[PDB]
Amino acid sequence: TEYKLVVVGAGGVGKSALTIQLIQNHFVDEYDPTIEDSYRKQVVIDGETCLLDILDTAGQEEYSAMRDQYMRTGEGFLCVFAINNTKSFEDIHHYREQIKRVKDSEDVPMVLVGNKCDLPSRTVDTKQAQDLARSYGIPFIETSTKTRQGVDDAFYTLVREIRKHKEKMS
Ligand SMILES: Nc1nc2c(ncn2[C@@H]2O[C@H](COP(=O)(O)OP(=O)(O)O)[C@@H](O)[C@H]2O)c(=O)[nH]1
């Protein structure tokens, strides 16, 4: 019943920072006597219990066996670039294409996220990113984990995208 969210993008764009901040504002303890400790932590977003994973392909993950498994298991993807890192924006299309290939689907819930929007050293304009998102047919939102701008909205929007997809498949 859980929604499986995956945060994907180039190294250093802020995927961990986004995910940590989301957990901080949304985790709760749940009573569940069927498990040994009787309580588990869970994240609830827009009324849905959500699982959270980060997909990174560089650094230590250059050595990982798990990339395609992350893509197959995830139900919706936050595709993150940083607004001060043009290469990270150029890398988005590769991630999206790989996800569509691995999932063998043209309809994969996704949201495009331009993180670090607090920074004054912008090299990716809001319009370039909006054009990309429009080509994909997905929402685009700018975020900052420093000011908190957009962070909740990015994940809430992804949850709605997944919900609408699950409604259609049903
Ligand atoms: N200015 C700014 N820095 C950020 C933001 N989000 C993350 N960072 C910083 O960017 C660096 C990389 O973040 P991290 O979460 O490790 O990125 P990941 O490699 O994509 O998981 C760290 O120094 C973070 O503090 C943001 O919204 N604004």
Swiss-Prot record:
What membrane topology is given? Lipid-anchor
What CDD domains would the database entry show? H_N_K_Ras_like
Q: Explain the regulation of its activity.
A: Alternates between an inactive form bound to GDP and an active form bound to GTP. Activated by a guanine nucleotide-exchange factor (GEF) and inactivated by a GTPase-activating protein (GAP). Interaction with SOS1 promotes exchange of bound GDP to GTP.
Which positions carry N6-acetyllysine?
K103
- Where, subcellularly, is it found? Cell membrane; Endomembrane system; Cytoplasm, Cytosol
Q: What Pfam family does this protein match (any one)?
A: Ras
Short sequence motif Effector region: positions: 31-39
> GO CC annotation: what is one?
focal adhesion
* Chain sites annotated for binding GTP: 9-17, 28-34, 58-59, 115-118
Q: Which of the residues bear the PTM N-acetylthreonine?
A: T1
What the entry lists under Gene3D superfamilies is as follows: P-loop containing nucleotide triphosphate hydrolases (3.40.50.300)
Matches recorded under NCBIfam families: small_GTP
Please state the pathology the record ties to this protein: Leukemia, acute myelogenous: A subtype of acute leukemia, a cancer of the white blood cells. AML is a malignant disease of bone marrow characterized by maturational arrest of hematopoietic precursors at an early stage of development. Clonal expansion of myeloid blasts occurs in bone marrow, blood, and other tissue. Myelogenous leukemias develop from changes in cells that normally produce neutrophils, basophils, eosinophils and monocytes.
- What exactly does this protein do? Ras proteins bind GDP/GTP and possess intrinsic GTPase activity. Plays an important role in the regulation of cell proliferation. Plays a role in promoting oncogenic events by inducing transcriptional silencing of tumor suppressor genes (TSGs) in colorectal cancer (CRC) cells in a ZNF304-dependent manner.
Q: Which family does it belong to?
A: Belongs to the small GTPase superfamily. Ras family.
Q: How does it assemble?
A: Interacts with PHLPP. Interacts (active GTP-bound form preferentially) with RGS14. Interacts (when farnesylated) with PDE6D; this promotes dissociation from the cell membrane. Interacts with SOS1. Interacts (when farnesylated) with GPR31. Interacts with RAP1GDS1. Interacts (active GTP-bound form) with both SHOC2 and PP1c (all isoforms) to form a tertiary complex; SHOC2 and PP1c preferably bind M-Ras/MRAS, but they also bind K-Ras/KRAS, N-Ras/NRAS and H-Ras/HRAS. Interacts (GTP-bound form) with MAPKAP1/SIN1; inhibiting K-Ras/KRAS activity.
Q: What is this protein called?
A: GTPase KRas
Q: What is the lineage of its organism?
A: Eukaryota, Metazoa, Chordata, Craniata, Vertebrata
Q: Which gene encodes it?
A: KRAS
